[PDB]
Design an enzyme around this catalytic site. Sequence first.
Site, PDB file in Angstrom:
ATOM      1  N   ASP A 150      -0.837  -7.249   1.626  1.00 37.21           N
ATOM      2  CA  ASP A 150      -0.184  -5.985   1.844  1.00 37.21           C
ATOM      3  C   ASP A 150       1.256  -6.255   2.215  1.00 37.21           C
ATOM      4  OD1 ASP A 150      -0.125  -3.245   1.946  1.00 37.21           O
ATOM      5  OD2 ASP A 150      -1.042  -3.130   3.936  1.00 37.21           O
ATOM      6  N   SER A 202       3.364   1.615   8.484  1.00 42.06           N
ATOM      7  CA  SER A 202       3.222   0.618   7.416  1.00 42.06           C
ATOM      8  C   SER A 202       4.516   0.117   6.805  1.00 42.06           C
ATOM      9  CB  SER A 202       2.346   1.126   6.295  1.00 42.06           C
ATOM     10  OG  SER A 202       1.010   1.129   6.745  1.00 42.06           O
ATOM     11  N   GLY A 203       4.611  -1.214   6.682  1.00 42.82           N
ATOM     12  CA  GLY A 203       5.758  -1.852   6.135  1.00 42.82           C
ATOM     13  C   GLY A 203       6.725  -2.298   7.169  1.00 42.82           C
ATOM     14  N   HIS A 220       0.839  -1.211   0.000  1.00 44.95           N
ATOM     15  CA  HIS A 220       0.000   0.000   0.000  1.00 44.95           C
ATOM     16  C   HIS A 220       0.860   1.241   0.000  1.00 44.95           C
ATOM     17  CE1 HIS A 220      -0.059   0.426   4.582  1.00 44.95           C
ATOM     18  NE2 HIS A 220       0.028   1.692   4.207  1.00 44.95           N
ATOM     19  N   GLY A 250       1.972   5.369   8.588  1.00 44.61           N
ATOM     20  CA  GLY A 250       3.406   5.594   8.287  1.00 44.61           C
ATOM     21  C   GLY A 250       4.388   4.720   9.069  1.00 44.61           C
TER      22      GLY A 250
END
Lengths: 95, 254, 191
Positions: free
Chosen positions: B90, B192-193, B41, B190
């Site tokens: 994701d 994310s990942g 994403h 933020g």
Amino acid sequence: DQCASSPCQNGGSCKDQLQSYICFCLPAFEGRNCETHKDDQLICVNENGGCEQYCSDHTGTKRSCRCHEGYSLLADGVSCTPTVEYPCGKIPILE
Amino acid sequence: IVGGKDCPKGECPWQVLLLVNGAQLCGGTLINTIWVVSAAHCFDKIKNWRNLIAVLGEHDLSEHDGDEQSRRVAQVIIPSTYVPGTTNHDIALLRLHQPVVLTDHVVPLCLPERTFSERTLAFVRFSLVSGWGQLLDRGATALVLQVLNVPRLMTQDCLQQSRKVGDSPNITEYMFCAGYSDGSKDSCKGDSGGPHATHYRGTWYLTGIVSWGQGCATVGHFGVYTRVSQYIEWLQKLMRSEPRPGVLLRAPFP
Amino acid sequence: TVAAYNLTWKSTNFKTILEWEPKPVNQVYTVQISTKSGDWKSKCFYTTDTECDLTDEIVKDVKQTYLARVFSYPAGNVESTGSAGEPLYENSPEFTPYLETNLGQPTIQSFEQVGTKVNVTVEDERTLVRRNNTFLSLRDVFGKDLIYTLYYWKTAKTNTNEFLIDVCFSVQAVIPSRTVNRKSTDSPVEC
Ligand SMILES: *C[C@@](*)(O)[C@H](CCCNC(N)=[NH2+])NC(=O)[C@H](Cc1ccccc1)NC(=O)[C@H](N)Cc1ccccc1
Ligand SMILES: [Ca+2]
């Protein structure tokens, strides 16, 4: 004596209750009747077959432990030790 | 990262910050010298693929010290079943233009074997989620890297304890919940990942990747993360095969 | 495949068995146990039983609150799914050994006399709680938490394993600070 039939196995002993009994097992057995051998369920779904990292269930034959890249299997056949400098998943300032 | 702490410097060594045109995008986890796992994403709205940098060894955004190493990101690979702006699949694999140098403050996170992930690590209770993303739902993004310990839930429980909503998506099998339903502690935007890392006997391994949620630390809700173990064989194929030529690559999944 | 239901704890003297239903039609079961912050630990691997002894796990700390869950597998998978990964399971109630364990029916072990004042001495029963492999007594585990009620032919009380009364008996293990299972069952009657 619910205990009259000595329903406690593998050397463990009975204490009566009313309309029941209780088995006290010796260290290596569990179960209601001490039927279960603690030493008898060395499979990978059980506590990673005692392997420090990777585990493999072998049909008919004792399970094996293995390790990640940059680690190798020790003498005890369970533990791994890094064979590299910065082995994944360990924190140098903490080592 | 809502309700966590500063990660003491060097104790989150596999954290990547990803920047673009200079600015914060996301986090990532470093799986070896050229390979970084993120969320797919993070890459929906990207323009300058050229200035997609990947920073490792970072800690205080606010001050340049020793230990940061930056690297152009040569390729983002996202599973072929990932559809932009939907929650499923994701995950991303980023190939850097050049190895980072392993140092005390740059060390990779083990990608475990699937059936170790599934049978063992998935039932260790707590695991750390980290990042430089928002510190309260609609609040300010962090400057000193944030770490947070969270508990993992089996999807049955995550479905029992969650206040329902007309279209909060399914928790699929490529997903999993963790955190708190009481409003106190979660991962935010933020992050994310970034890594959800699980500690077992003395080594950290990558079990999940920051992904999505309803707000952050919303009451009656949990954080959702990509179940990395559904992906282990796909990532490894990708790490083992010959570079292909794109920035964005949609490699096949399963 | 069908999920366990009526997950119940049958605990007396810290011997703790989780039972459930149904008796398995071509499925097997495994049980897991954690404390609330701990990791899950599997037991009773792929059984076709509807019980599981969890004593060895729960006696590792009697004061903790344990949760258990019981997964369900078709005979000869584990796996899965999916709806969404993951094997089918169902959860037990929480269970805090120290508070909820049934106190075993006591046995009056002494009954000797000092004339008009009579001495009845309750036996310091052993429990399933090990320490260095060797079982701890009922009085070891509870301490000044456990008291006794006496009967005779009328009522009397003590903390200790000792009464002295005034001219046939039962006792009772009692723990008053208990929200539940406060009083044990009446000992067997002695004359
Ligand atoms: C990429 C990330 O940085 C960030 C992580 C936030 C995690 N939140 C919690 N509580 N742990 N994720 C997002 O910004 C995602 C991005 C996204 C993914 C798929 C589709 C659209 C957007 N956004 C969300 O998490 C939204 N809250 C998604 C959503 C939640 C509930 C209902 C509808 C949509
Ligand atoms: Ca810095």
